[PDB]
Amino acid sequence: GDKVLDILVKKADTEETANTLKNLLLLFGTLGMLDVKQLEPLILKVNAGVASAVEQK
Amino acid sequence: KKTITINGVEMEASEEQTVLQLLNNSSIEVPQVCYHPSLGPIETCDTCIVSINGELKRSCSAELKDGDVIDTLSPDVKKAQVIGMDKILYNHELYCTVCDYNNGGCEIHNTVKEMKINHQSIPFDHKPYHKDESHPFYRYDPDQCILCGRCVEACQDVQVTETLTIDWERKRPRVIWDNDVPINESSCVSCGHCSTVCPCNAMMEKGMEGEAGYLTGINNETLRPMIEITKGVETGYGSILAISDMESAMRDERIKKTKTVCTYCGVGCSFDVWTKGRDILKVEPQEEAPANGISTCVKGKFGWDFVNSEERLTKPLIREGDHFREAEWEEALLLIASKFTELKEAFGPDSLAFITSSKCTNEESYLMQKLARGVIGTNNVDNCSRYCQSPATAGLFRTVGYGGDSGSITDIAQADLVLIIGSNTSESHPVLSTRIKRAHKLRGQKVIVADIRKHEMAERSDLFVQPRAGSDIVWLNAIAKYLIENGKADERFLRERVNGRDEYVKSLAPYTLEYAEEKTGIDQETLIQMAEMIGQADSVCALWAMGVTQHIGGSDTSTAISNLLLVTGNYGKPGAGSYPLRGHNNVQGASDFGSMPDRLPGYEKVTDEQVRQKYERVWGVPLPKEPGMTNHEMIEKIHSGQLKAMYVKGEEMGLVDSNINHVHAAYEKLDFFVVQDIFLSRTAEFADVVLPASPSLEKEGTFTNTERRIQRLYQVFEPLGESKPDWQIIMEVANKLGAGWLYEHPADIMEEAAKLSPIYAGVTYERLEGYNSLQWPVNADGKDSPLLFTERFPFPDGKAILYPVQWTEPKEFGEEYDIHVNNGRLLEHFHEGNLTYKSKGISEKTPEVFLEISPELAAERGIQDGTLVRLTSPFGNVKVKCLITDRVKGKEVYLPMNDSGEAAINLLTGSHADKDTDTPAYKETSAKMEILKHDGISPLPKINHRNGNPQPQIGVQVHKKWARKDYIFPGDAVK
């Protein structure tokens, strides 16, 4: 297990992976900040609009 | 008084000087990282910024002036505290989840959580310095050092070792030992103050390192990348702080934190012992500890590896033929019981003598004396106190009537003058010396050290005078004569609470100042000036350890010291009195519970009808009218055939008694011998049956330290193997002797002894819970007596009596025994070292005994360092290495007791003891000087603490930090 953890950290320690995890957490936080109660009518309207768009043959 | 307003609400002021104390008492959540209650304002973390009089200032050092306005929720003060903590975290990596100190007590973690911070404006920057793992006990991590200075303030002001400074002038400030010497090579006493007082994991014991939690045992090569990952992943400190709190809860299950009292010396410092199963991870002192608080030495805070040592006797040993067979508990118990019954019903109980250990709890010594009297019917009981505290206690009886110290170590600090004579308090009772040195360096108290050697305290004393061997009585009585003759003595106290002043003056007729100058080999000016100081000093605290009491006239000079304070008038005054340095952790407790043969538990003489009747009623067995023989005279009685059997527990008296050739001959002469030691000690080698003792960590009891404090212990570990706590062993032995004792836990023993002992009338286990401690005497209501002789003396008239004594001639051999070797103990090592040697770190600091020899005598005799030399006395012949130092002067040389082989000093000492108490004169030794090997390895390594050069400075010297251009005060930074 020590070797497994060592491999995991040595591969992950690249700035790209740390940035990826940080931005995933930030995306979760922002999606939490975004209010979705008002977004349900927007989703319904988007559904109707996509239906109308694909209706055009 | 001194009305104040804090948080917009009116509040009152107390004796506290700084705003921080008031805020803490008001439960205001003000960040205080660099402040420790014992350390005092260090002012180096600037996180305690509050608005006093509207201006931003450090609450840790802001004086609580009348009428000031205090605000702590203002955006300004919050921003200042945030900036200060950001500067702190710039020096702290803050990997709380994988950090050993995150046991939830870490001030950076707690304070960071309290401020609800989420970002650090200045990112963490690793210092160029690497971790200093040179020390075998605690490491320093400059990368994690926040420069709060608590460790430096501890090493400079509250422990006064002065090995720690801070190089503020350096580009990256850091803690440096001596002149930036690596830690091991420096003058670090290894006391542990820096480790205990460190807020962060910067200065933390190697025991915790990689062993505290679950995720902290990960290898650094694979832990550091994880730390960098988490640094680059989490955006706010709150969530990962909560995860670290969960990891603290993680640690809470595996980490057992139980209070105990150190076994080594009589200061009786109490601390939690943070363990993980069986190994000892940390010794954490607590501010609530009565005897020490945060104070600790190397022994009590890094010397506990003996508990887990493989040498520990896990099973009873029986002498089978020419070997020690590992026998069962029951068969060994039956053997010892049958043998004791045989020698009890054949030659009578009077031929039975048992010794309790002064290192064991009060219950242990009480069980020894009960087994001797309430079971066997003999009175032959003693302890190390016969060698240690018998003359001091005898002098206290002769003048004051109560044994033990007059007060607590806090009263020692409160003294204006400390009169230490024959005491190596720096190396024997380290924490008390830290208190004295703290009061000397900070409070301005001046101390007078009077001993032949020049230890750490002697070179740090106001007036250090070295008298002749055992000549303390002469100059002391001359000083008393001068004080009582020139009117400086407290005549009012003499008429109020003292008796026989004129008789004592008549006894002082032959004593003159020039007489003492001639006898002690000390110039008149020093004696007259120290007498003037004693007369002028308002409060006097007199400490006399074995350097004076372990003499042929040791009891006489003990009475002389006590009546010297009596003439001065320091008894009953807060902060002053006589504090005989009780050596073992429970030598005071053992003496309290009838260890000495002439007294019963409760410090009552055996030859008293009322106490004998009471003990008969409680025990059901008649008490021996004949007083028991003293420990030293036991060997002579054996050589006369009077004594045949010994039951000595936890005392290696075959190596620590005077003339150990004599005790070896007695041991080979006696028939039956049973010993009770955790380790196969030297005494344990000569025994018909060896009983496996249990160390104080693995047993629960009460330890009575030097300050007459009875502090209750806790069972840190289940006993190793199936060995039992010594009280359990004594209960089993007595039950096999038809005693009928039923003690499930030592609380019953404690309360029974409390009922029996008038002095211990009030001590009970529910009154000793946690860190609560009671100082004997205690009455039935439970109110102890922190200061002795406060209102009246114990004598029937209520007034003490001066004891007329003279100079008893020391039994110097004379003639060819020219060089007068002195015997004592080192700071790191404990006696022969049956416990410290088992700890690897202390062994590295001091591997072997050495003979400290004076530079002047190094010329006439032509002796060098690292040389094997021979010392021959009519009682022994030792081969000890040599050390060159200025601590000793002239012919007189220092031979510490830190070896148990052929190099033990106890060969040289003879069977000449005190008249009053038969205490061997260990300090009265003479030998030869034979040169065997010219060139050899120096016994003292470079990594020893004596080789370093401490830097004496008062405080962290923050003013150097404030002078740095890069430093900016957060209060005016926010502006």
Ligand SMILES: CC(C)=CCC/C(C)=C/CC/C(C)=C/CC/C(C)=C/CC/C(C)=C/CC/C(C)=C/CC/C(C)=C/CC1=C(C)C(=O)c2ccccc2C1=O
């Ligand atoms: C389909 C299939 C079957 C596939 C199989 C193969 C496959 C793809 C497998 C998945 C592999 C993956 C993605 C594994 C990742 C998930 C796992 C199993 C993880 C376990 C490994 C470990 C040990 C992870 C670390 C967990 C953990 C809680 C670590 C501690 C975090 C650290 C080091 C924090 C240090 C730390 C820092 C750095 C702060 O800044 C800070 C600031 C304020 C307060 C506290 C802190 C603090 O503690």
Ligand SMILES: *SC1=C(S)[C@@H]2Nc3c(nc(N)[nH]c3=O)N[C@@H]2O[C@@H]1COP(=O)(O)OP(=O)(O)OC[C@H]1O[C@@H](n2cnc3c(=O)[nH]c(N)nc32)[C@H](O)[C@@H]1O
């Ligand atoms: S008692 C005793 C025990 S129990 C325990 N032993 C101990 C301790 N610490 C450590 N680290 N290891 C141990 O083994 N502390 C406890 O010490 C108790 C006795 O300690 P002392 O303070 O009496 O210790 P030493 O014997 O080392 O130092 C005594 C000093 O006395 C001076 N001295 C010697 N002969 C003298 C004389 O004739 N006159 C005077 N005025 N002084 C004399 C020397 O300077 C010794 O240093």
Ligand SMILES: Nc1nc2c(c(=O)[nH]1)N[C@H]1C(S)=C(S)[C@@H](COP(=O)(O)OP(=O)(O)OC[C@H]3O[C@@H](n4cnc5c(=O)[nH]c(N)nc54)[C@H](O)[C@@H]3O)O[C@H]1N2
């Ligand atoms: N030359 C010379 N000789 C001296 C002295 C001196 O100054 N000079 N000082 C004298 C004095 S004051 C004393 S204290 C003696 C020191 O002698 P003792 O008081 O006998 O002390 P130590 O050998 O340090 O400890 C005795 C044993 O106790 C055991 N032990 C430790 N903890 C426990 C425990 O909890 N329970 C039990 N049952 N055993 C335990 C240890 O294994 C150790 O072997 O030396 C005396 N001899």
Ligand SMILES: CCCCCCCCCCC(=O)O
């Ligand atoms: C003469 C230009 C004709 C443009 C027709 C555009 C598409 C109309 C139908 C849209 C649909 O329903 O797909």
Ligand code: SF4
């Ligand atoms: S020292 Fe304190 S704040 Fe720093 S990582 Fe360790 S527990 Fe966390």
Ligand code: SF4
């Ligand atoms: S003496 Fe050693 S352990 Fe004690 S504070 Fe100084 S450096 Fe730390």
Ligand code: SF4
């Ligand atoms: S090592 Fe000393 S100065 Fe540095 S953070 Fe720890 S206690 Fe403070």
Ligand code: SF4
């Ligand atoms: S000073 Fe004595 S009692 Fe206190 S920790 Fe050190 S050895 Fe233990």
Ligand code: FES
């Ligand atoms: S407690 Fe005052 S600056 Fe740290």
Ligand SMILES: [Mo+4]
């Ligand atoms: Mo002792």
Ligand SMILES: [S]
């Ligand atoms: S002792």
